[PDB]
Design a protein around this nucleic acid. Structure first.
Ligand SMILES: [Zn+2]
Ligand SMILES: [Zn+2]
Lengths: 286, 178, 113, 113, 178, 286
DNA sequence: TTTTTTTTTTTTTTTTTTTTTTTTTTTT
């Protein structure tokens, strides 16, 4: 079939339903109550093809039959499913007794859908784990963010409300930004932490940081100047600390490689010593 | 660019040959006895004395002992804050620029923080691993230098054996110093 | 110019006559809160550690850096630094001490300029 | 309460309109590894079996339990269970199918309470 | 003693009349439509669905279809192990005690193992043979029951015709149920 | 003595052997080769009393001493002979140095001269073939056995050696014991398999079973408790399997009928179907 | 031909802010 997800519509003939999609998301299986009082199972996934996305809902025995067999990145082919309108007005694929799923199908539409040393890191690197020393603190600041998309919100003086360009009138949350450098003995890389991860490393609340930023701005400093000053004056104590950062490396058009850290954690010393023992064995020490 | 901080024993820093760059913007560096060019140092030791803060707060300093040597760590002006952080007895990790004052090598503090005793163990393991890695590479590079010197032919031979071109220049510079 | 002599890492049973400043790691077995002294056992021996101000707790694993005092009553250590080594992997420390003992003299002797 | 309908044993040529779940036994003659379909020949006909994950080999004797799919392209079986019937005595199976056909209705009709 | 596991069609178990013994030690049994007293069942079918193991491992179950009916097979506590053995599509032979839950007959797994397709054929042949043997014996026993009932005279007549005394009691019990 | 030929059994005390028999057959004397390379003589006769027949084997000087003195129809009395099992499983009388024969004695005895259903099985049944389902697993264990007689060997802590009561100092072999139940639809019977037959059915080596038994015993279980536990925890997979067992039925004074299986084999489905067809023909089906 | 001995049975389940990287020298 040439059918695409964009062509699905609620109530279309299940006999016409023939789409493929790569799995983007898998949600946990849930229980639901039937009209007769019994309890069934239901599980949802999000798939996408070259045209759009669809929620795929596995019902009852279809959960046991397929749910554990499917993983993110896999492609599935869906046949004979009922199409329903989602709560947002979009088509969803319901996998009931009649429906079938083919895991990693042979279909022409399919083609159309780690510890690394800093010296080896490249631009665009994904899922990189780097263990090193905090060497520099560039900036510490907090901004008002949307609680859903975490993007910067704008204060409207005419209406007295906070406006998110994606979600409209929202209640803002304080988001912490920590920019620092990390050294592993073979290289140096810039690192950025956000919100809860940054607050955990800094050991200071975002509301307290906002108050200190306000005091600096009142003195005649801009937001840029106040952020650099607070990092040097109050958060210099964090320098010299050995940590493990995990994230993706983006290349700034002048700042160079910046590691956007998704998480940070304390060094597992026994794990690190075992890595060193492996290297020593390779050198003919042990 | 920003070059790496090399993890070393204090003894290796102390016994090294400090090189003062004549340019007002060029970074100073040290060449160890094993031909290792070091711009920044990364050491793990114990603060042996209560820090020294000048009354006028112009400088702050503290002493670090790692078992192989004892070195002073200095912070100037507002950088005196680094010395105020530590206390006698703290087990710390220090990163900074190597400096030489009164023909005695020292560390110009860039960062100092308290570490867990297992970090001191990890530091010793890493320091020894890196040292062996470097010595074996420098031994092969020294043979290349004694046979060919710094020529286009020797640079090709060095790359084939996993040796950086910079290593041959360090050997030549060390021979010039000695 | 009496430059500070680095603390020489030793076991209680391996302390030498020529040693003036040492680093010992053990478990506290007795604390005398009146004479400010404590008994440190490392597995190889027991040393009497005279402390000036910091007294550890009984059963605490500690690292002591001190000057050796040789008198008619025996050899006691005047503690300079006492650190909490309670979560320290002494098995790993022992292994690195043996690696340094074997490999450090060989690395220095490889220099044939 | 839609209780699972037992698989009705049939020959490809004897499949009825009212049949929703069937059991067929035959030899694979063609396997399409891209559309996940295979051709099963039992001696009485050829059925196109659409499989979800298990694809047999060409020339393999297999037993298929599946739901019948009736569309504009014809009648294809969506395979639920595919079993290896390679060492199965189909001569004996055919003989027992005839024995059950003859004797089962007579046994039920013997009840005169 | 330990009575036999009767080889039957799933249909015969499903259409039967389960009898719960009031005693805490008495075994439960089923009486088929052809007056067959069954304490244990021996069936051969295909596992139609991937097994169901409760997250808390308190129970494990799997479904078996033989062509004449579909029945659930259950193992509790550590007996959940029986359900873990099988997979969707396996052709298996099951032996166990007949149970009734929610007025639906089921099999409390005592043993489950994969069988060769010729075993399924052998099972069908044996099931039919035993069924004919039983029906003919029960037909003669029913005539004895309708003429004399459960008397000392009818028990002697039953033994002479190769009928067990227990068969007359099963007929009487079945008449009481219906 | 009142002893009869029917009462002889292999290995019975030669001092108890006292039988009479009339000579039915005399075979020619033969030569045989001894273990030392020399050649001896041996001659056989068949005798019978009011109870049965026995082969009488005259060895070496007993041939010269008695063979020509005996004739068909004569009665002999046999004393102090060794009793052996013949090649057909029957008692034979061996007339060696110790044995005696009395020709035409004065004795009061002189004037007097398969496939089975479990429901049909009796105690003491021999060579019974039963096809059924494995229904229960009682115990799985291994013991140190003598490689000759296969009996349990004792470890002597004083000498550090393994002692067989029949063969002395021996090298022990691990013997597997499998106790289970078998059901044929008409009855239930207990079954015991040994060594190679049990290992073949279990699909696990005796050394591996010994290791698992050791782990269970170390936990605080006795040998009895550990054997029952291993059968339920690891060998429960064998239950539900259809097999053919052949053996002799012994009656335990509390456990009931136990079938000591000499061998086990997979079911020959065509052979079984033919047996069923025979039964169906008898019922008037075909 | 073998080890060691007490047979079986009921009931339990649902992706972000905002953007110009690094560097020397100063010490009671
Ligand atoms: Zn938003
Ligand atoms: Zn023996």
């Amino acid at each position: 079939s040439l059918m695409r997800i964009s062509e699905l519509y609620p109530g279309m003939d299940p006999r016409e339903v023939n789409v493929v999609g790569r799995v983007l998301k898998k949600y946990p299986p849930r229980e639901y109550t039937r009209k007769d009082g019994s309890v069934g199972r239901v599980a949802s996934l999000i798939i996408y093809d070259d045209s759009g996305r669809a929620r795929v809902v596995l019902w009852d025995a279809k959960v046991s039959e397929y749910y554990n067999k499917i993983e993110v990145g896999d492609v599935i082919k869906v046949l004979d499913a009922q199409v329903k309108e989602s709560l947002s007005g979009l088509p969803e694929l319901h996998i009931n007794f009649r429906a079938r799923i083919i895991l990693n199908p042979d279909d022409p539409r399919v083609e159309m859908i780690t510890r690394k040393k800093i010296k080896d890191i490249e631009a665009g690197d994904r899922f990189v784990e780097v263990r090193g020393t905090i060497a520099k603190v560039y900036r510490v600041l907090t901004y008002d963010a949307c609680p859903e998309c975490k993007k910067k919100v704008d204060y409207d003086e005419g209406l007295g409300v906070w406006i998110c360009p994606e979600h409209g009138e929202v209640q803002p949350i304080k988001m912490t930004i920590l920019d620092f450098g990390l050294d592993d003995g073979t290289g140096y890389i810039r690192v950025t932490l956000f919100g809860d991860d940054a607050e955990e490393l800094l050991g200071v609340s975002p509301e307290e940081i906002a108050e200190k930023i306000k005091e600096l701005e009142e003195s005649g400093l801009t937001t840029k100047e106040a952020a650099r000053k607070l990092a040097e004056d109050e958060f210099y104590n964090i320098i010299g600390r050995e940590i493990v950062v995990r994230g993706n490396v983006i290349e700034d058009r002048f700042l160079g490689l910046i590691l956007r850290a998704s998480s940070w954690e304390d060094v597992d010393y026994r794990r690190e010593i075992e890595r060193i023992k492996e290297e020593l064995e390779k050198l003919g020490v042990m | 660019k920003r070059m790496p901080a090399t993890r070393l024993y204090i003894k290796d820093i102390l016994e090294g040959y400090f090189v003062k760059s004549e340019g007002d913007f060029e970074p100073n560096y040290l060449i160890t006895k094993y031909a290792r060019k070091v711009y920044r140092a990364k050491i793990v030791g114990t603060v042996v004395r209560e820090p020294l803060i000048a009354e006028d707060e112009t400088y702050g300093k503290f002493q670090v002992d790692d078992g192989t040597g004892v070195i002073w760590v200095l912070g100037f002006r507002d950088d005196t804050k680094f010395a105020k952080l530590v206390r006698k007895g703290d087990l710390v990790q220090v990163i900074g620029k190597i400096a030489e004052w009164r023909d005695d090598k020292q560390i110009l503090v860039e960062g100092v923080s308290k570490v867990h005793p297992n970090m001191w163990i990890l530091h010793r393991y890493e320091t020894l691993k890196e040292k062996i890695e470097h010595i074996k590479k420098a031994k092969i590079a020294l043979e290349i230098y004694n046979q060919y010197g710094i020529t286009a032919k020797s640079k090709v031979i060095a790359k084939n054996k996993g040796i950086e071109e910079e290593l041959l220049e360090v050997i030549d510079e060390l021979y010039g110093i000695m | 110019v009496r430059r500070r002599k680095p603390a020489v890492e030793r076991k209680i049973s391996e302390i030498r006559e020529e040693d003036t400043r040492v680093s010992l790691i053990g478990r506290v077995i007795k604390v005398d809160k009146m004479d400010y002294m404590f008994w440190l056992d490392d597995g190889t021996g027991v040393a009497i550690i005279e402390s000036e101000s910091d007294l550890p707790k009984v059963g605490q694993v500690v690292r002591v850096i001190g000057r050796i005092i040789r008198n008619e009553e025996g050899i006691h250590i005047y503690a300079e630094v006492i650190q909490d080594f309670s979560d320290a992997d002494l098995e790993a420390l022992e292994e690195i001490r043996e690696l340094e003992r074997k490999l450090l003299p060989r690395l220095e002797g490889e220099i044939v300029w």
